[PDB]
């Protein structure tokens, strides 16, 4: 009894392509363990693929893998990891030539090295559990006639063997080990703060990435990571029962110095993605940071609206103000200042900076220049004069790659040096250098944690009313009607599915606007915890808050409640192409909308 | 006898849109002083507009305006300026509501503030001179039927009144003054080097730009430019007979310091566009620099192929080399080093740098850091240790906006300080600061003027053979088949017509490839002069040369000989949408092609 779908396609062979519409909302049993529901049908063969939901039984033990017999009680971190393993096993089927033929007609979201919650694969209650996988399938045509034999080949000779062999026939022991490792990664990260660290870098980690675009670990001539002994510490990982050792970094300022190309940025990049759990053989596994960490850099030409950058830029010429700063075209230093103050507003407790991509004028200032141009005639206060304030008064740590100056040596708690990819702790040497040279707080903090900033939907969106489609373009941008929001320098976005999540939230605001703003604001404001990209709901620290950030957190939480598919009118996406992202990245995107208007 | 075109459109009213093809290559006299030739006809009403050539008599005195009675003998600088004035007068007609109705169907290239040679408007021999203007016109349809009345309205009630009133009826005295001023700008710039300067900034200049996208001068609260007396000098402008006074900058290193937002970058931006003549009321008029000046900045993530960056980055770990450097993903410092060495190869004798957009690690290094990480373990040599070499041994000057360090004070010839938009010469103060502090050449130059670098068309293009359309996207990029060449940080591109010129040259190489490489190389190598963007053919200085740059100069020269319309197979453009660009920007684009391959 698996032939009805084939019998259908045989019946419409050669007929007008429009007649495919009759598949809409029908479900077919196409093999013993595979059902397929058509969620939508392409209007013609050149349109984007028809969306389907494919369903298989869950054949592994829930008790062994998820530690419960009841699916609804399962730890979301383990459920997410299991969905991520199934997704990888599906794609591995293609790589290993499991389909009898590969049509090129099937599109399923391809995961990065990171283990994110995604709408692609769901472990759900059976219609005991089943597995749903969402895909788009280009139903072939000859001109405007249906290629029924071509369609039959896709379903019966491609999707069926893949799902039967790679999903129904998945290796349960590999699945279990994947899920243990991910759960231990998440428990390790969540133990950092309590143990007195902002970051941990496992011994044996392979940090550099291979050549090109795979983001896979460098396969040859890689120097495994080895902690300086002065910083080495050990964590027990309860799910695998293992003990891991590596470099712990304490709160305060850590500097990473060393020659260009000696491994500094590679270490820092592993830290930036340390907010995500990784596939087990990734190399950066158990390299973790505070989940609110934000990569800060210069970003000249971006727009800014209503951000208080007065801690870094103040006293402009001609009474111009920076307490509610607005620009359509930021410089290096003003973009970086705005990036910092926006990250603080969205709650980041750890700033990660790389001198190679910061604005010099915000990083450094030497004594010679101050004699020529006195501080009172220089609007810009460098980060070195604010970094201790952030840390001591607001508990915000900083990790900074540096190479050009020793001006941070006195402020630093730890100074690392990378040389030929080997790391040393050189804190004592640096302090001696600073003390033997000619370098230079119950003082009111310049940082105001109660930020006064509210989204103005009317002013933000009105320009654009003059369908209203919001869509994600790769990982690089969002088209918002005729506007383009450039995300290419929001560096902790790792999957195009996350840009789709962002687009949905921005459209939600557009489609909901008057009442949705206060509602999301109230909802986000009442939250004590937010979902991480790994599906786990963590406690929110830090005193920084604002209506704008609470509103963003409410959107993000609401998208999580809707399983990453908001289905709002102005953002139409095929189902199963969205990946979880922090409310931080959703706010980063709205901050960059060129028509943005905010108000006090 | 002007009704035949109307009679045609009346005859095809309501007929199939395909029948418009019969207009191809026909010419119509649509008023006493206006002819219109259809160069191509849209295949349907949704296609890009049909291209037309519109021709009017030249009614001003050639002798008065161009100083000759024979068009072919006219100075190209004056001919270009006259074409640019006609183009502006045409667009001004729209602004002033001259057409009886504005259909929105007519597209003619819109000039920037700069006076470039363009294929849009030509002063040509009469079929005594006439004026050609190239346009695209969307011939309206109702569904797939011809709207003949709509077309008649465009030609007879829009283009005819515009051309009759604004081109045939142009103000000859305004035209003359435009042409005098432009010619004086060009003569001023070409006199710089001989007089001992690399830049001149006229007194009375208004440098800041108004809010937003117009690039017009700031209309309110602008502080006119006033030279420090120590640098003030005077030039006589022979065409107007006037004498202009302003700040002359001598060869060597000039620093521009002062607080953020006190006017430094605004001065530097006026210098970067000082390679172009400007419309007379622009504000930056008579602000000129060496015509080979290049804006240098950091540009992380660009690709580089076969560039010797060894003067800045050398002695990497593990015998990696930088004498023929290759990367798919440059850092801040490596992109900036490559930008510098590529500009030198293409012949630039003046580097313009803004600290706010440079890579810190290439700009600066202090003594404290050198004690922690000795110079021998640091691949990166900062620009401050190479800037005197460039200047003394190769005659390459530098003008740099700085704010973070006094480390360049000893090397500088001139130190300017901007405060509240007022400028001072503070060279003496800076030198005293450096001498009273603790700061630190028949030495072999590290810079090799005989660059060894050849374009490899086979390796560069082969990937992309797997129509081959090359096109310009605004001023931001070129689509080269499925490749995208990002030009958004090639900052002296000022018109989308220039990106079209670039695209034509790149397609020329693609379409011509084996034999075209040696031919262009030989042609560019033999040139003693190249055409400027203003249409004037200047003498090429400096010893830097390579096969790659000669090849680029040959392409640029050949495009100039073809009046900015190459008509190569892989780059199809409507006629009249191209603007002159230096061979420097054409090479900048090819340098950034991600499949680029070069060879020694
Ligand atoms: N542990 C390692 N083993 C092998 N190669 C490495 C390692 N760490 C970094 N690299 C490689 O060295 C090169 C330069 O590294 P990077 O950290 O960019 O240096 P920096 O940021 O100090 O300029 C990169 O191509 C990187 O992949
Ligand atoms: N001569 C002037 N008159 C009026 N405004 C000016 C002048 N020069 C610059 N400005 C304005 O001051 C602001 C900051 O100028 P900018 O040169 O960017 O400073 P910096 O590069 O020193 O940070 C800009 O908006 C600019 O338009
Ligand atoms: Mg680096
Ligand atoms: Mg960009
Ligand atoms: Mg600036």
From TrEMBL, chains A, B:
Mg(2+) 1 binds at residue 265. Residues 172-439 form the ATPase of the ABC class C-terminal domain. GO terms for cellular component: cytoplasm; nucleoplasm. Residues 4-169 form the ATPase of the ABC class N-terminal domain. GO terms for biological process: cytidine to uridine editing; mitochondrial mRNA processing; mitochondrial RNA processing; mRNA stabilization. It comes from the Eukaryota. It holds the Pfam family ABC_N. GO terms for molecular function: metal ion binding; mRNA binding; nucleotide binding; RNA binding. Residues 469-598 form the MRB1590-like C-terminal domain. The keyword Nucleotide-binding applies. Keywords: Metal-binding, Nucleotide-binding. InterPro entries: ABC_ATPase_C, ABC_ATPase_put, ABC_N, MRB1590-like_C, P-loop_NTPase. Mg(2+) 4 binds at residues 505, 555. Mg(2+) 2 binds at residues 265, 300. The keyword Nucleotide-binding applies. Signal peptide: none annotated. ADP binds at residues 223, 261-266, 329, 421. Mg(2+) 3 binds at residues 265, 354, 356. PANTHER family: ATPASE. This is Mitochondrial RNA binding complex 1 subunit. It comes from Trypanosoma brucei brucei (strain 927/4 GUTat10.1).
């Amino acid at each position: 009894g698996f032939s009805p779908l084939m019998d259908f396609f045989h019946s419409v062979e050669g007929r007008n392509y429009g007649e495919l519409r009759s598949l809409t909302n029908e479900t077919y049993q196409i093999s013993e363990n595979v059902r397929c529901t058509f969620l939508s049908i392409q209007s013609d063969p050149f349109a984007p693929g028809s969306q389907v939901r494919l369903v298989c039984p869950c054949t592994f033990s829930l008790e062994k893998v998820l530690q419960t017999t009841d699916l609804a009680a399962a730890n979301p971190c383990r459920r997410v990891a299991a969905e991520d393993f199934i997704l990888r096993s599906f794609h591995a089927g293609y790589r290993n030539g499991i389909p009898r033929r590969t049509s090129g007609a099937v599109q399923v979201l391809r995961p990065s090295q990171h283990v994110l919650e995604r709408s692609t694969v769901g472990l759900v209650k059976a219609h005991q559990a089943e597995i749903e996988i969402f895909a788009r399938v280009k139903l072939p045509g000859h001109g405007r006639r249906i290629d029924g034999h071509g369609a039959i080949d896709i379903f019966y000779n491609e999707l069926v063997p893949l799902l039967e062999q790679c999903v129904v026939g998945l290796n349960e022991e590999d699945l279990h080990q994947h899920v243990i490792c991910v759960h231990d990664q998440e428990v390790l990260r969540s133990n950092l703060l309590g143990a007195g660290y902002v970051a941990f870098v496992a011994n044996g980690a392979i940090l550099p990435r291979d050549a090109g675009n795979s983001d896979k670990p460098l396969r040859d001539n890689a120097v495994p990571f080895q902690s300086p002994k002065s910083l080495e510490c050990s964590f027990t990982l309860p799910h695998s029962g293992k003990t891991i050792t590596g470099m712990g970094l304490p709160p305060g300022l850590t500097l990473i110095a060393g020659g260009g190309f000696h491994g500094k940025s590679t270490l820092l990049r592993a830290l930036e993605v340390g907010i995500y759990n990784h596939v087990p053989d990734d190399g950066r596994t158990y390299v973790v940071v505070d989940p609110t960490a934000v990569k800060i850099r210069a970003e000249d030409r971006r727009s800014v609206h209503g951000v208080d950058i007065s801690p870094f830029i103040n006293n402009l010429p001609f009474g111009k103000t920076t307490n509610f700063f607005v620009t359509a075209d930021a410089s290096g230093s003003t973009s970086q200042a705005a990036n910092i103050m926006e990250a603080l507003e969205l709650g980041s407790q750890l700033l990660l900076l790389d001198e190679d991509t910061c604005a010099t004028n915000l990083m450094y200032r030497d004594a010679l220049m101050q004699m020529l141009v006195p501080r009172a005639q220089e609007p810009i206060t460098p980060f070195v004069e604010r970094v201790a304030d952030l840390s001591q008064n607001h508990g915000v740590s900083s990790i900074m790659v540096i190479g050009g100056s020793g001006q941070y040596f006195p402020q630093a708690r730890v100074v690392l040096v990378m040389n030929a990819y080997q790391i040393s702790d050189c804190t004592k040497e640096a302090k001696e250098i600073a003390s033997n040279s000619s370098l230079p707080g119950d003082t009111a903090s310049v940082f105001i944690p109660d930020v006064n900033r509210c989204f103005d939907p009317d002013g933000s969106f009105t320009t654009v009313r003059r369908g209203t489609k919001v869509s994600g373009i790769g990982t690089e941008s969002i088209r918002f009607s005729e506007e383009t929001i450039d995300l290419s320098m929001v560096e902790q976005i790792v999957e195009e599915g996350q840009v789709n999540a962002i687009a949905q939230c921005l459209a939600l605001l557009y489609d909901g606007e008057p009442r949705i703003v206060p509602e999301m604001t109230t909802k986000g404001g009442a939250l004590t915890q937010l979902p991480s990209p790994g599906g786990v709901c963590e406690i929110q620290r830090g005193k920084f808050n604002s209506n704008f950030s609470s509103m963003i957190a409410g959107c993000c939480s609401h998208q999580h409640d809707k399983r990453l598919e908001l289905r709002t009118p102005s953002c139409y996406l095929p189902r199963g192409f969205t990946s979880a992202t922090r409310h931080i990245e959703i706010g980063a995107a709205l901050n960059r909308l060129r028509t943005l208007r905010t108000v006090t």
